[PDB]
Amino acid sequence: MNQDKHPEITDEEQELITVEELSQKLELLYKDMEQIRRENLLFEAYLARNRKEIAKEDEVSEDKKGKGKKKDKNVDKKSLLLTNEEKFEIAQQEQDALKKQIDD
């Protein structure tokens, strides 16, 4: 077997490659964090805007809190995060609300 003897890479070359990879991963992580922060702002605006509905609707139903002893269904935490369709619906609803906000 022709054992292709790979040339010895200087530790300087390995160190520079590691630095480049770290810079690339930092860029990726900063982009991800910016996206997540934008999504955080969008969802915070959505929740605050609908809290008027949340507050208005919660107040109305407080007096209706009867003797309902319905067994509490065990929904896994994986179902408390918006799916693709729900995330798109939230994004479109907030897009429309924001467009109305700019208009007004």
List interacting residues with another protein (CB under 8 A): 12, 15-16, 18-19, 22-23, 25-26, 29-30, 32-33, 36-47, 50, 53-54, 57, 79-88, 90-92, 94-95, 98-99, 101-102
Q: Which of 97, 86, 103, 81 is nearest to 49 (CA)?
A: 97
Work out the burial of residue 15: count CB atoms within 10 Å of its CB; fewer than 13 is exposed, 13-18 middle, 19 or more buried. exposed
Shortest distance in whole angstroms from residue 65 CB to another protein: 14
Shortest distance in whole angstroms from residue 25 CB to another protein: 6
For residues 42 and 91, the answer to whether their CB atoms sit within 8 Å is yes
Shortest distance in whole angstroms from residue 72 CB to another protein: 14
